[PDB]
Amino acid sequence: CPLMVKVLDAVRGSPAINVAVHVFRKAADDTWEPFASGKTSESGELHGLTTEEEFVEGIYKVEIDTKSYWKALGISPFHEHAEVVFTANDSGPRRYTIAALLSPYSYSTTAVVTNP
Amino acid sequence: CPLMVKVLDAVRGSPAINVAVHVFRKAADDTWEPFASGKTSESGELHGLTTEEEFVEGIYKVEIDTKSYWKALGISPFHEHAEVVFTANDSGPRRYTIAALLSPYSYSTTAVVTNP
Amino acid sequence: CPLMVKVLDAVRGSPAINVAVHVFRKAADDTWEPFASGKTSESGELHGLTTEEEFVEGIYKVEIDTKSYWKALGISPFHEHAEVVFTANDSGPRRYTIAALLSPYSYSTTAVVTNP
Amino acid sequence: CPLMVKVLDAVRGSPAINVAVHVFRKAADDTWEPFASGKTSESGELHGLTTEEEFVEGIYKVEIDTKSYWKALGISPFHEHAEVVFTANDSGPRRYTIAALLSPYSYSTTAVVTNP
Numbered sequence: 411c412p413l414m415v416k417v418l419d420a421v422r423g424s425p426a427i428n429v430a431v432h433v434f435r436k437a438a439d440d441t442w443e444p445f446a447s448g449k450t451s452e453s454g455e456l457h458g459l460t461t462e463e464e465f466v467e468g469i470y471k472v473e474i475d476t477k478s479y480w481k482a483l484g485i486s487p488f489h490e491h492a493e494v495v496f497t498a499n500d501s502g503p504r505r506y507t508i509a510a511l512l513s514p515y516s517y518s519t520t521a522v523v524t525n526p
Numbered sequence: 527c528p529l530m531v532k533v534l535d536a537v538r539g540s541p542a543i544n545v546a547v548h549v550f551r552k553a554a555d556d557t558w559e560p561f562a563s564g565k566t567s568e569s570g571e572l573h574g575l576t577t578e579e580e581f582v583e584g585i586y587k588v589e590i591d592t593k594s595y596w597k598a599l600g601i602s603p604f605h606e607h608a609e610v611v612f613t614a615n616d617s618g619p620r621r622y623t624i625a626a627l628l629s630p631y632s633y634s635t636t637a638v639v640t641n642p
Numbered sequence: 643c644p645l646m647v648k649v650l651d652a653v654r655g656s657p658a659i660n661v662a663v664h665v666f667r668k669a670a671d672d673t674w675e676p677f678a679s680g681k682t683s684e685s686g687e688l689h690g691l692t693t694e695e696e697f698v699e700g701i702y703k704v705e706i707d708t709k710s711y712w713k714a715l716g717i718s719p720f721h722e723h724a725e726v727v728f729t730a731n732d733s734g735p736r737r738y739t740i741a742a743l744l745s746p747y748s749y750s751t752t753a754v755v756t757n758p
Numbered sequence: 759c760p761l762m763v764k765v766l767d768a769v770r771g772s773p774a775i776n777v778a779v780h781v782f783r784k785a786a787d788d789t790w791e792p793f794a795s796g797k798t799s800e801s802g803e804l805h806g807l808t809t810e811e812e813f814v815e816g817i818y819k820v821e822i823d824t825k826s827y828w829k830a831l832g833i834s835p836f837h838e839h840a841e842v843v844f845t846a847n848d849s850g851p852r853r854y855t856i857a858a859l860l861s862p863y864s865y866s867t868t869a870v871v872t873n874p
């Protein structure tokens with residue numbers, strides 16, 4: 411609800427299904443602490459990562475396991491993973507969607523931040 | 527239903543709302559004939575462009591009026607518009623989503639083609 | 643020199659070699675008139691399309707023949723071409739680099755505009 | 759020479775000048791060790807990060823300091839940085855160009871890998 415991840419595949423023209431996604435929150439000692447994770451669904455979406463109560467301001471990292479995704483499809487990939495790092499800021503009501511568009515040697519990411 | 531367009535804004539991190547979208551189908555004489563049009567909604571999506579009966583195989587052009595979108599936001603843009611040209615092919619049941627991610631001097635587009 | 647095109651391949655992580663590019667300019671009667679054409683080199687770059695004298699103000703369309711590129715590599719891609727449409731030189735001469743990053747179901751384009 | 763980074767700005771249509779870039783290499787104990795750093799020139803390019811001798815096999819992370827770039831232009835961007843993580847030189851030496859295209863709420867990255 412506060413945070414959704416969506417992953418698309420630029421080679422096949424499809425959602426990127428069954429991609430592992432790990433979210434971390436930066437701790438006080440600057441290390442990355444596990445926060446939430448899951449696998450994208452048949453629509454390429456990963457819902458239910460967190461709740462409003464749990465998702466406080468801070469620095470988050472979303473790691474998308476692109477390498478395993480490509481290897482499951484039999485395609486040779488460049489990256490280890492894709493990492494999206496951002497600050498969550500409570501500037502009134504907000505929902506964050508982190509979207510990624512994957513190719514073997516490239517990826518694109520955007521944030522769609524809306525007031526629900 | 528068979529064809530949806532979604533437009534996102536990379537500068538503001540938001541759906542691209544109220545963007546005009548024109549779809550054309552290539553005619554026998556190679557000209558582009560108007561086929562469907564609309565404006566993206568508050569979610570950046572444009573539904574209801576066509577129906578299964580109307581959307582036959584052929585070459586289609588989706589023109590996204592990016593210049594007017596940026597000017598309504600007070601941002602100076604490079605492109606006249608963004609044009610996505612593709613062939614619709616009846617390889618079993620298919621839904622097409624044409625997605626575009628806009629910046630003033632760049633855009634990205636992908637096709638998400640799924641079997642419903 | 644005033645207009646260069648660069649094309650990269652996001653599947654292979656390489657320049658996109660031997661990509662045909664056609665440039666058109668909108669004529670007074672609103673049709674697209676041929677302006678220049680060429681193909682990308684081993685570096686993915688296409689230089690020498692035009693000259694400072696010939697590259698006057700106007701609305702230009704750079705058509706990158708992405709389908710032909712993919713088909714020659716044995717791939718069936720989604721798009722027919724990538725088209726980049728922009729007004730050039732409207733505040734005096736500029737140098738334009740039009741870049742494209744290709745995948746079978748997606749492309750991205752950017753413009754770099756410099757004042758010489 | 760074996761590792762170059764190029765950064766472009768999708769808002770202005772320009773090279774992204776004075777962008778700080780930090781490269782790390784995974785050490786035997788799985789931590790990220792500093793490897794090289796620099797900043798992009800007026801062309802948006804960063805050359806001379808490393809040498810053929812120093813750029814051995816390994817897992818490398820190229821951190822592009824996009825937030826610092828935007829903040830110096832007076833813009834509040836979404837991401838903290840753009841990180842590009844890849845195994846290099848695993849089948850012998852290659853030349854790598856890591857490119858990034860920046861917007862306030864989005865970025866794209868690609869790799870061009872060539873065999874010298």
Ligand SMILES: COc1cc(C(=O)c2cc(C)cc(C)c2)cc([N+](=O)O)c1O
Pocket residue numbers: 416418507509510511518519520522532534623625626627634635636638
């Ligand atoms: C929020 O919802 C959506 C977002 C996006 C996107 O941000 C995106 C992101 C990138 C990097 C490229 C494109 C062309 C688009 C695509 C979607 N889509 O269904 O293709 C979508 O639904």
Ligand SMILES: COc1cc(C(=O)c2cc(C)cc(C)c2)cc([N+](=O)O)c1O
Pocket residue numbers: 648650739741742743750751752764766855856857858859866867868869870
């Ligand atoms: C000028 O020279 C180059 C330009 C560019 C680019 O404009 C570009 C364009 C797009 C759509 C995405 C990215 C990440 C970058 C990439 C290059 N490259 O090596 O990936 C390159 O050499």
